[PDB]
Structure 1
């Protein structure tokens, strides 16, 4: 099974026995993709243990995999286990079981359902502000992920259920080389999610929203599973990106102020953000997108090719994991001038047309893109408005400059993001 890419004439790094190419991960998912893009070009292949993975960087082939051929060939991602009852989580569910969940959960983020949330989100921003107001009157450097995550959790627990609260590579490696082991642990009730975190949220907080539109077909224990996915995403993604944004706004203060100028213009007299005002602030949208260009928290996009196929002149055999190196594509000089620099004018209406939506995919594409994309943009933006309407952000003595990325996991920073905060 280690000669497939040799047989198909697809270039790639030479795999070692059993391990595959996993030892190359010693600089992260990303430095590996950025490297292989340079060594081999538009298409290359490698192995996660015994699992062949084909990496593609061709926009047409990309568009083919995620959109044109999704329902037929590329419906599902790489199997993830041990999972337990989380196999039915929408992000993990396969084929027809996924099609049913995606439909039942689609109407949660309609432009009207989000618009219903602008009044309820509007509370914890003031909880957010007042919490940042206490650690700013004091010149104590702030850990931004913690105050954002406290906010992010406050939104996800209420935006979906309605509980108000003031929020104040160990073994997975083995899996890659031992995917044959996954059904082993599937019969041991072993979960990658420690069975004490799930027994907890197995609080069936349902009473006599996201919670609403479910019981309004669907089961109950699988309702738990979906809730975990949303609580996690709505928490960690928002917090993480909010931290990436504040770091970039401080090291680039001209961007931070020019943003502040737009916010106080659209919202005069520190006005309260509403749905329609947020969709008018362009420079805000540009800053968010440019951060997501530099820091796509998903790093990769994956689909299991579920039958033999010839797309865009390349044959692809059943079972191969097709992969899209999002991080590498967002940083490719063959599409971006000086790609390491935080330049939000890449996303201005003058220049926003010179960008392929299959090179820039921070939320995926096709029927299995990020179901929570529009929410995340809205939730984050409301945070950025309220936070920046009051405070500026300077680097501090401990602030990591330049910021190193962590290794594997998600796109997360090595040392936490800590910045000075000043009150306007």
Structure 2
């Protein structure tokens, strides 16, 4: 526990670390309550220790811009190592330094404004499966678990958008990682993997069946100043894209319908805009989705209250002095997204759901280095524009046909998962009525 003197040395405040465990006992309320607490206790800058690992929290918008944008390529290029990963080390979210720059370049043109516009005709199909799957549990007044019917939709979208397969989708340990990061190299040599060695084995061969069948995201990889992309590295990117495109889309869509249900005036104000831009229940298109500003305002304000990443992190790969502060090599620099999204020194009534904060009359009084639901700089969420489009296309088709009211078992107020990831404690269950 010799490393527990770094912040005492640097004169940076923070909680006193216990030996070996560091400050991780504080995570007993979740990452987010710990961040919101430390933010209040120490101010703009503090540090703590995930085990022996020093973690410096920064909340200064200038310092955040320095870390995420100005000094990304040079110092803050990678995140805090994750293991064991196995062959998934070559996935873009996990790859480091030059290996990541190459996969970023090769995978970037997948989410152009043009490649997205090609997917709107394809996404529209499963939105109608989503309505019809919802029309069944609606004509029977049985409360609906949203993440089920949303995840069935989100799953349908990601398989075809990246590959082309069409399916009606109705057919405890990481605690030790941070106290035993020295055990990560141990597990890497045992082929153990946080990704099950079966799901990966399924897709590794499934992709090489799809590759040698047509011969989409699967198309653009074999098609492409660097080297070219490999094959086991092609499977790894698909696995990242399939996870994100499913669990992020479904979880946020569930978060949105909970708020639309507990704020019926906003749910009606949005249903009115959807019928105006799309009269006669018109099919949403790429350009109509980009016209609905109150839909974007709802999506944005929901992602303020539930930034599913909670924290942004970068590893300081060498000694730097950013915005007048010395940061030694090896430190993980952390931006507490959840805490800043709820900071009263920037948001009025930050626990209330108020989409009007993002009105064009008010969207200017909002610092983009405080509101970072997708990150910033060269390593932001590569699938941001696709995520916004995917969700918005789902809300339109769903609110065009249904209205949502709370039930007896609806968790009000919603308890967040006091665990790790950002999910609700109890699932989101609402009553669906047909218009």
* TM-score normalised by the chain length of structure 1: 0.99
**For the Cα contact (< 8 Å) 2:207–2:235, is it kept in 1?**
no
**For the Cα contact (< 8 Å) 1:169–1:409, is it kept in 2?**
no
Shift of residue 194, structure 1, vs aligned partner: 1.8
Shift of residue 55, structure 1, vs aligned partner: 0.1
Note closer, same or farther for the CA distance 1:261–1:169 as it changes in structure 2 (3 Å cut).
Answer: closer
2:170 partner SS:
coil
For 1:11-410, list aligned pairs within 5 A: 11-168=13-170, 170-206=172-208, 209-216=216-223, 217-410=228-421
Shift of residue 58, structure 1, vs aligned partner: 0.1
1:64 and 1:282 map into 2 onto residues whose CA distance is 31
User: Which residue in the other structure is 1:415 paired with?
Assistant: 426
1:207 partner SS:
helix
**For the Cα contact (< 8 Å) 1:404–1:413, is it kept in 2?**
yes
**For the Cα contact (< 8 Å) 2:20–2:52, is it kept in 1?**
yes
Shift of residue 207, structure 1, vs aligned partner: 5.0
**For the Cα contact (< 8 Å) 1:128–1:147, is it kept in 2?**
yes
The worse-fitting range, judged by mean Cα deviation, of 77-86 and 406-415 is 406-415
Question: CA-to-partner distance for each residue in 1:348-390, whole Å, 9 max, x for gaps?
Answer: 0000000000000000000000000000000000000000000
Shift of residue 200, structure 1, vs aligned partner: 1.8
2:325 and 2:246 map into 1 onto residues whose CA distance is 40
RMSD: 1.6
Shift of residue 285, structure 1, vs aligned partner: 0.2
2:39 and 2:110 map into 1 onto residues whose CA distance is 38
1:421 and 1:206 map into 2 onto residues whose CA distance is 42
1:211 and 1:156 map into 2 onto residues whose CA distance is 11
**For the Cα contact (< 8 Å) 1:245–1:288, is it kept in 2?**
yes
The worse-fitting range, judged by mean Cα deviation, of 180-189 and 194-203 is 194-203
**For the Cα contact (< 8 Å) 2:122–2:161, is it kept in 1?**
yes
Structure 2 stretches of 5 or more lacking a match? 211-215
**For the Cα contact (< 8 Å) 2:357–2:363, is it kept in 1?**
yes
**For the Cα contact (< 8 Å) 1:150–1:168, is it kept in 2?**
yes
Question: CA-to-partner distance for each residue in 1:200-233, whole Å, 9 max, x for gaps?
Answer: 2223334570000000010000101000000000
2:71 and 2:207 map into 1 onto residues whose CA distance is 39
**For the Cα contact (< 8 Å) 1:77–1:302, is it kept in 2?**
yes
2:34 partner SS:
helix
2:400 and 2:203 map into 1 onto residues whose CA distance is 35
**For the Cα contact (< 8 Å) 1:144–1:417, is it kept in 2?**
yes
1:172 and 1:207 map into 2 onto residues whose CA distance is 33
1:126 and 1:333 map into 2 onto residues whose CA distance is 41
2:418 and 2:72 map into 1 onto residues whose CA distance is 30
1:204 partner SS:
helix
2:420 partner SS:
coil
Shift of residue 34, structure 1, vs aligned partner: 0.1
2:298 and 2:208 map into 1 onto residues whose CA distance is 38
Structure 1 stretches of 5 or more lacking a match? none
1:125 and 1:283 map into 2 onto residues whose CA distance is 20
**For the Cα contact (< 8 Å) 1:169–1:408, is it kept in 2?**
no
2:362 and 2:188 map into 1 onto residues whose CA distance is 50
The worse-fitting range, judged by mean Cα deviation, of 406-415 and 351-360 is 406-415
**For the Cα contact (< 8 Å) 1:304–1:319, is it kept in 2?**
yes
Shift of residue 192, structure 1, vs aligned partner: 1.1
Shift of residue 393, structure 1, vs aligned partner: 0.0
**For the Cα contact (< 8 Å) 2:91–2:233, is it kept in 1?**
yes
**For the Cα contact (< 8 Å) 1:204–1:224, is it kept in 2?**
no
2:272 and 2:378 map into 1 onto residues whose CA distance is 37
1:409 and 1:203 map into 2 onto residues whose CA distance is 32
Shift of residue 82, structure 1, vs aligned partner: 0.4
Question: CA-to-partner distance for each residue in 1:125-174, whole Å, 9 max, x for gaps?
Answer: 01100000000000000000000000000000000000000000911000
1:383 partner SS:
helix
Question: CA-to-partner distance for each residue in 1:258-315, whole Å, 9 max, x for gaps?
Answer: 0000000000010000000000100000000000000000000000000000000100
* TM-score normalised by the chain length of structure 2: 0.97
Shift of residue 196, structure 1, vs aligned partner: 1.6
Question: CA-to-partner distance for each residue in 1:310-345, whole Å, 9 max, x for gaps?
Answer: 000100000000000000000000000010000000
Question: CA-to-partner distance for each residue in 1:83-128, whole Å, 9 max, x for gaps?
Answer: 0000000000000000000000000000000000000001000110
Shift of residue 408, structure 1, vs aligned partner: 3.6
**For the Cα contact (< 8 Å) 2:414–2:424, is it kept in 1?**
yes
